[PDB]
């Protein structure tokens, strides 16, 4: 079945996240990004990563979704000031939501996977 991994990354705490933590996050993200979903591309910056939702399309018949989620979670767990919250939502429900604030709404409307 088609699903979206909804991911929300936020920089908690004033003990700023290092530039290399940002780089590591942007790389885990960009591993899933292709020309199909070029908009999802991440940079190692506040503007690109802090308080941003990203919605990653998966066919869950593939082990890919779980591998991706596993990497993000392990990564957040190694960090002190990068919080990651993850939800799943079925694609048929996702594409039915409004375009405006879609991912925020998918996050309110989906099943929560984890929050670190």
């Amino acid at each position: 079945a088609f699903k979206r991994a909804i991911i929300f990354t936020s920089f908690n705490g004033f003990e700023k996240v290092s530039r290399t933590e940002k780089r590591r996050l942007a790389k885990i993200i960009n591993a899933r990004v292709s020309i199909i979903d070029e908009y999802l591309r991440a940079k190692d910056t506040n503007a690109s990563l802090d308080g941003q939702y990203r919605a990653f399309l998966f066919n869950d018949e593939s082990p890919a979704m779980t591998e991706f989620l596993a990497k993000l979670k392990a990564f957040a767990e190694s960090c002190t000031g990068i919080s990651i919250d993850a939800w799943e939502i079925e694609e048929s429900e996702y594409v039915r939501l409004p375009v405006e604030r879609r991912d925020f709404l998918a996050a309110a409307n989906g099943k929560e996977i984890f929050k670190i």
């Binding site: 088609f2 292709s34 020309i35 199909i36 979903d37 908009y39 399309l57 998966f58 066919n59 018949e61 593939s62 890919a64 694609e91 048929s92 996702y94 594409v95 039915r96 375009v99 405006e100 879609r102």
Partner: protein
Amino acid sequence: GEIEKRQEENRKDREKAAAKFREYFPNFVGEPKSKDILKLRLYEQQHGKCLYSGKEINLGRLNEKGYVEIDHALPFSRTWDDSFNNKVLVLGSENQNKGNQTPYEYFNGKDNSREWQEFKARVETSRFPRSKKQRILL
């Protein structure tokens, strides 16, 4: 080298894109062609919706003949040949009355119809290149 560099960058882009395509569509026969990838990219760029009707596209059926099609939003009277990028994804059952009209024409732009307004809203919240958005809206 510059040609060779470009070749190799384009192979990498396309392998990455094909890989996702195969993940999504494990029962699809053959390697995806450029047009198959393009249906998927326009599906994403249009937030999963037919650009003319605003109807949801069943991604499961994306490769079904008849179901969705790539159309030229404009006839060749506004693009001699290939000066555009104005390819849009539309459901099969929503693009027959259009003929050779532009979207402005077809959707009653001069009257500022509510359906013109909706079409315009779908174009502008799309992820199409800025220039594509403009071409499409006459």
